[PDB]
């Protein structure tokens, strides 16, 4: 309820102020007178997507520290971060981070 009302107020104020900005100077009269598709940017976007997926895997860490199985969770988190570093290293050594 409160969050819905806050978002609605933000959107309403932004819309009102942008529209008055776009319409206040529209009342007075004036004159009123490709291909390249670089591959590197796509690789940057795909690398961002994959790293974002691995980050999403890393996100439940603050709650995983209270499990009473500390050794197993530490091993698994270190494993995830090690494979993240391995992905970065593989893309580094295969000339995937060049311009």
């Amino acid at each position: 309820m409160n969050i819905m009302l806050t978002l609605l107020t933000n959107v309403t104020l932004a819309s009102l102020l942008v529209l008055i900005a776009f319409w206040l100077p529209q009342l007075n009269a004036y004159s009123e007178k490709r291909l390249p598709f670089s591959m590197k940017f796509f690789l940057v976007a795909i690398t961002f997507l994959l790293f974002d997926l691995e980050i999403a895997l890393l996100l439940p860490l603050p709650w995983a520290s209270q499990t009473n199985n500390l050794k197993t969770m530490l091993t698994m988190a270190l494993f995830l971060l090690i494979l993240l570093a391995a992905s970065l290293a593989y893309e580094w050594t295969q000339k995937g981070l060049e311009w």
Partner: protein
């Protein structure tokens, strides 16, 4: 009285960002052996007002061939997200108390790139499209390390609740516990908002401009809450408010200082910077901050 609270949150931010433009020209001017605006108003105090009036009265140059839909949607989304980022923050008490406030801010920052994408696509120009693609790639690249650093820092907090950051830093700032993460976080917040040395790129222009400066001030507030924790007394929150605002002002003046001090990077240079210096160190420090509470038996309480 919730609408009154919402308005008393929204309006002062716009006034602050309106007077932040006057403070930026003054600080830069004095760093350049000159003065800022000191004619319009007793000390340039009316300069922000004059600029706003002139901008809202100047003709808008609609491309006459662009898609009007995305053209009008982009500033709405930008300003709405910039204003929404403010609600979660605790100064000392948040307008809305969220359990996953930090995650909410991360999600909003993730959305923030759609305005750039839509403005670049609807501009009806190939060069503007190239610039927009370049900016979007830089933004997503740096938000990666923002997220990783943020979770590494929160590993000492115990949750995603923003109010818990005040309790965590009751005796000592988080700056002393992990300063390298703070350094990389500050540089990443520089790169996120397209501030020098990373600034590689009438109405709608005014709207976009307001959104950027509100994002700058919000980044400063989040950084101040995260790394320089002020002591909060439940029977007098005004002290916490004063300390938090002073720290935010100092950090914003620090961005202005950094703008006045340095040249700018190339694009390949900033991509190499991130992907080959910040990401490896961020991963190593994330491993270290995962291991440290277990090694020292200092796991934070909440679960």
């Amino acid at each position: 009285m919730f609408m009154i609270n919402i308005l008393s949150l929204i309006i002062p931010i716009l006034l602050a960002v309106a007077f932040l433009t006057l403070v930026e020209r003054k600080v830069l001017g004095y760093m350049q052996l000159r003065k800022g605006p000191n004619v319009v108003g007793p000390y340039g105090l009316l300069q922000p007002i004059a600029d706003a009036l002139k901008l809202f009265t100047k003709e808008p140059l609609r491309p006459a061939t662009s898609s009007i839909s995305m053209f009008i949607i982009a500033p709405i989304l930008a300003l709405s997200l910039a204003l929404t980022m403010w609600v979660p923050l605790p100064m000392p008490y948040p307008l809305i108390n969220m359990n996953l406030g930090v995650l909410f801010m991360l999600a909003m920052s993730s959305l923030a790139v759609y305005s750039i994408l839509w403005s670049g696509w609807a501009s009806n120009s190939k060069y503007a499209l190239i610039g927009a693609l370049r900016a979007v790639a830089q933004t997503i690249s740096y938000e990666v390390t923002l997220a990783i650093i943020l979770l590494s820092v929160l590993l000492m907090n115990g949750s995603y609740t923003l109010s818990t950051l005040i309790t965590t830093q009751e005796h000592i700032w988080m700056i002393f516990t992990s300063w390298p993460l703070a350094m990389m976080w500050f540089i990443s917040t520089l790169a996120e908002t397209n501030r020098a040395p990373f600034d590689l790129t009438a109405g709608p222009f005014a709207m976009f401009f307001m959104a950027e400066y509100a994002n700058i001030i919000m980044m400063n507030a989040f950084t101040a809450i995260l790394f320089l924790g002020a002591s909060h007394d439940p029977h007098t929150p005004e002290l916490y408010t004063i300390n938090f605002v002073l720290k935010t002002l100092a950090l914003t003046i620090t961005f202005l200082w950094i703008r006045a001090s340095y040249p700018r990077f190339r694009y390949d240079q900033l991509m190499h910077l991130l992907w080959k210096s910040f990401l490896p160190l961020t991963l190593a420090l994330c491993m270290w901050h995962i291991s440290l509470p277990i090694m020292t038996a200092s796991i934070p309480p909440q679960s």
